[PDB]
Design a binder for this molecule. Structure first.
Ligand code: HEM
Ligand code: HEM
Ligand SMILES: Cc1cc(Oc2ccc3c(c2)OCO3)nc(Oc2ccc(-n3ccnc3)cc2)n1
Ligand SMILES: Cc1cc(Oc2ccc3c(c2)OCO3)nc(Oc2ccc(-n3ccnc3)cc2)n1
Lengths: 290, 290
């Protein structure tokens, strides 16, 4: 067998132009190929402009339409995602001009707001600035945007919870404490941000509940040789029947037969690359500056 | 003399509870003893919970903190390891929930990535699921993660190379062919996985070169009576001066005076058991199912 690694790690230098160029060209082909017989002269003009940009600046910028296409094809290329059958239903938020952690925070609040939509969940992705030299990465240290702390609590976040504590987050001691956002901008040490409680929608099932929005915070989007290490996205959720009942009763989207049908109906009315990679946990690789 | 065996062999049955219990208790003591005067009541609570677990399930699970402590103490207890002077500099990857060979492969890719770090080598260990009845062992059949094939090539891998061939691996015939990973999961027949070439960093010294990452693939970690037969780890390397020059020139970590000092400085800023045992080569003991 010759499987590929599903993980894409850090760099300390910009991608060499001899590597970047061929990948960019191949992506540009995939993009314009989605027009088949149309736009041959536009295709050629874009190839020429991308090359000059790479040769003069060392890298290049995608157009908004190219980025939207990229996020949807990478979703389509996601092997285990059951949601990818309706890949055209995706809202993109372009945050490639973001510069600070405070700004990252505001972008994520907007994402959570739009995607939760009072319970009528919508799929979205927010794209932060692409990697440059690898020393100025944007990263979300959380694995999901919304997740409970573990001390009592979620057993699988003991490590990250302790980390938030080490960073000056005050630990409550319930079993449903929503962890803070831990946000790295421009390669700096991360900063801790409480999520405004009113942004977190929960479904009550004894005192049992769970958050409504499943959003992956920690993967990397690759496209045409460019890498975006910060690109949170969300879908909706897929002895056990209590939950299926509680979400429907409370009008929160899950992937039941009705939803599978309607979301597919909406879709129809509309080495793999591009691709979403896993990353190495940033607290294992980060060099602290203070 | 009464030396102990440095080898720990296979089982066909779970460890008897009368043997496991005392060993678990002694390890729990060693762990909480590293707090001296603190945590007497936590110590007692953990003893009680471990016993009930063993008495009801036949075995027990370490906490993440206990596993990290165990891997570092076993390194400290390694008689011939020169690296053990800085035993606190060790990154642990917890893979105890791994179930398939494809999954083992992805864990090892991640390990190789993190540890190589573009040449700035970091020590790491990846821990796979502990032994249960001895019939479902996880094992790496390689002796090191990275090693060259021998036909022409490395003279000391003729046997393993032939084995890879017998298993359907296509033999090149250079003298620097990187062997495939041969991975056993859940006691099944091993599967063969090519290592992605870009994951293998080499130092060029005539056409002479060598791989940068020395990683032992085939030992067993023992702790509190539990056995982990799959736990690859790595450090860095220790008429001959050509190599010492080439690694430094190419910015790949070796154990020279500068590195000895800095790694020790970082450490200070931070029957033996636990212990790493040797094993019997698995192709000598494995019963094939197909
Ligand atoms: C609309 C709702 C969606 C549903 C119901 C859905 C469902 C799933 C499920 C069930 C998994 C497997 C997780 C597991 O192993 O437990 C998965 C994985 C994943 N999903 Fe989604 N998803 C949705 C939306 C999205 C979106 C919007 C994206 C990205 C734009 C996406 C990207 C991925 C990726 C990259 C993985 C991992 C794939 C892999 O490792 O093979 N999903 N999804
Ligand atoms: C940081 C770099 C490290 C260096 C420079 C280093 C160096 C060495 C050397 C020179 C040997 C003797 C090999 C021989 O006989 O040729 C050795 C053996 C060994 N090392 Fe390391 N090591 C390092 C990291 C590690 C790590 C991370 C572990 C485990 C967590 C480890 C565990 C062992 C074990 C179990 C042996 C065999 C000990 C014995 O049989 O007496 N080493 N190491
Ligand atoms: C232990 C655990 C349990 C769950 O619960 C699920 C299970 C299945 C599923 C979920 C969450 O969202 C889409 O389909 N999620 C996670 O983390 C995830 C994984 C994937 C995920 N996702 C969103 C869109 N695509 C994948 C969200 C949250 N961890
Ligand atoms: C014939 C041969 C030659 C070498 O070369 C060395 C020698 C010394 C050394 C090495 C590799 O890594 C740490 O110190 N390694 C091996 O296999 C090993 C042994 C130990 C080893 N190791 C890594 C960490 N601790 C021990 C890695 C690879 N075999």
């Amino acid at each position: 067998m010759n499987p590929k690694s599903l993980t894409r790690g850090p760099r300390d230098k910009p991608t060499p132009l001899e590597e970047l160029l061929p990948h960019a060209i191949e992506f540009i082909n995939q993009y314009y190929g989605s027009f088949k017989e149309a736009k041959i002269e536009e295709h050629l003009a874009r190839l020429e402009a991308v090359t000059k940009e790479i040769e003069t600046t060392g890298t290049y910028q995608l157009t908004l339409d190219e980025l939207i296409f990229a996020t949807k094809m990478a979703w389509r290329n996601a092997p285990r995602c059951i949601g990818r059958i309706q890949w055209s239903n995706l809202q993109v938020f372009d945050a490639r001009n973001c510069s600070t952690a405070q700004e990252m925070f505001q972008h994520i609040c907007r994402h959570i707001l739009y995607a939760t939509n009072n319970g009528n969940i919508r799929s979205a992705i927010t794209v932060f600035p692409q990697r440059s030299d690898g020393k100025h990465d944007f990263r979300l240290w959380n694995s999901q945007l919304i997740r409970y702390a573990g001390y009592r609590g979620d057993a699988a976040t003991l490590e990250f919870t302790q980390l938030c504590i080490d960073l000056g987050w005050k630990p409550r001691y319930g079993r449903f404490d929503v962890l803070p956002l831990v946000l790295q901008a421009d390669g700096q040490d991360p900063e801790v941000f409480e999520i405004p409680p009113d942004l977190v929608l929960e479904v009550t099932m004894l005192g049992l509940k769970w958050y409504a929005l499943p959003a992956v915070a920690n993967m990397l989007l690759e496209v045409g040789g460019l890498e975006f290490p910060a690109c949170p996205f969300n879908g909706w959720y897929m002895i056990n029947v209590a939950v299926l009942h509680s979400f429907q009763k409370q009008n929160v989207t899950i992937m039941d037969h009705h939803t599978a049908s309607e979301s597919f109906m909406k879709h129809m009315q509309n080495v793999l690359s591009p691709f979403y990679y896993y990353q190495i946990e940033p607290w294992k690789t980060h060099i602290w500056q203070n």
